[PDB]
């Protein structure tokens, strides 16, 4: 259930999931006060859906 705060260096707030090919969008959570990418993990400098990584 870990989430990653949407990178401000990308400025598009999205990345293309290479494993199942969905465009990953993120939402601003007003309670935590940050943009969220949930079920997401960074592997070797790239962000992937954490759910998808297990298939590889
Ligand atoms: Zn995915």
Distance 46 CA to ligand 1 centre (A): 13
Distance 51 CA to ligand 1 centre (A): 7
| Token pair recorded at residue 3 | 């989430």
Burial of 13 from C-beta contacts in 10 A (0-12 / 13-18 / 19+): middle
The answer to whether the CB of 24 falls within 8 A of the CB of 53 is no
The answer to whether the CB of 56 falls within 8 A of the CB of 46 is no
Which residues, chain by chain, have CB under 5 Å from ion ligand 1? 17, 20, 49, 52
CB atoms within 10 A of CB 37: 23
- Please indicate the experimental technique that yielded this structure: NMR
Distance 43 CA to ligand 1 centre (A): 14
């Amino acid at each position: 259930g870990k989430y990653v705060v949407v990178p401000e260096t990308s400025q598009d707030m999205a990345f293309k999931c290479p494993i199942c090919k969905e465009t990953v969008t993120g939402v601003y959570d007003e309670e935590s006060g940050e943009w969220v990418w949930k079920n997401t993990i960074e592997v070797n400098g790239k962000y992937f859906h954490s759910t998808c990584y297990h298939e590889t």
